[PDB]
Amino acid sequence: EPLPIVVLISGNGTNLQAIIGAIQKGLAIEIRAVISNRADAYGLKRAQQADIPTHIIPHEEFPSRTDFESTLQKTIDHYDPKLIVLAGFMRKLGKAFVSHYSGRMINIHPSLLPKYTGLNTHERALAAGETEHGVSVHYVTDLDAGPLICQARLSITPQDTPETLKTRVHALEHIIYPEVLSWFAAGRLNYHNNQVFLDGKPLAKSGHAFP
Numbered sequence: 001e002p003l004p005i006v007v008l009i010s011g012n013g014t015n016l017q018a019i020i021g022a023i024q025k026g027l028a029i030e031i032r033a034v035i036s037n038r039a040d041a042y043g044l045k046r047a048q049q050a051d052i053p054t055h056i057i058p059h060e061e062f063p064s065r066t067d068f069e070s071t072l073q074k075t076i077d078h079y080d081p082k083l084i085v086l087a088g089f090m091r092k093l094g095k096a097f098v099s100h101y102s103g104r105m106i107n108i109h110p111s112l113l114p115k116y117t118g119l120n121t122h123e124r125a126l127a128a129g130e131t132e133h134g135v136s137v138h139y140v141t142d143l144d145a146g147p148l149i150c151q152a153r154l155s156i157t158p159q160d161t162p163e164t165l166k167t168r169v170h171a172l173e174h175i176i177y178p179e180v181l182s183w184f185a186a187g188r189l190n191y192h193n194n195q196v197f198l199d200g201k202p203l204a205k206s207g208h209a210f211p
């Protein structure tokens with residue numbers, strides 16, 4: 001029986017597409033709604049194509065961050081999701097909002113956290129001369145930070161450019177996000193006392209590693 005989620009987006013929503021595809025292939029997830037803070041997010045079209053209700057909640061149209069967040073939370077909660085899943089959602093969320101969803105809200109980030117929070121991760125890893133790079137899935141707490149669930153890594157080689165890395169890491173995103181969602185659907189994950197547990201066992205701080 002599918003675990004109900006709500007997905008938050010700001011843009012293209014490529015990870016939303018990956019989840020949509022995985023569901024078609026049997027992933028036990030129901031996307032009850034997709035919510036965007038931008039009317040021009042292509043991800044809205046991805047959702048509509050899959051007959052998923054979409055909500056636009058333009059953050060600038062609210063007197064304050066808390067009003068915006070209030071409408072966001074009420075819109076989310078209407079669907080009684082078990083999990084809130086960020087997919088390219090770019091607004092920072094306040095302390096209260098993050099608390100309301102503690103243990104129930106996750107994000108995917110195209111770096112090996114805690115390195116390279118923020119934008120342009122691939123170019124920054126290259127510029128620093130990293131030999132490894134990848135993607136992290138974590139609970140939301142601080143910019144792109146929180147207890148790690150899963151981290152997938154790959155090698156940077158001499159012919160890599162920021163574009164090859166972005167594309168190769170995009171493949172890892174499409175693999176690991178739906179996989180983590182499958183862990184939640186199967187009741188395998190817990191967040192307790194600053195630690196993540198998988199099948200009742202503490203994960204390493206870096207989360208479950210691939211390869």
Ligand SMILES: [Cl-]
Nearest residue numbers: 153154155211
């Ligand atoms: Cl590898």
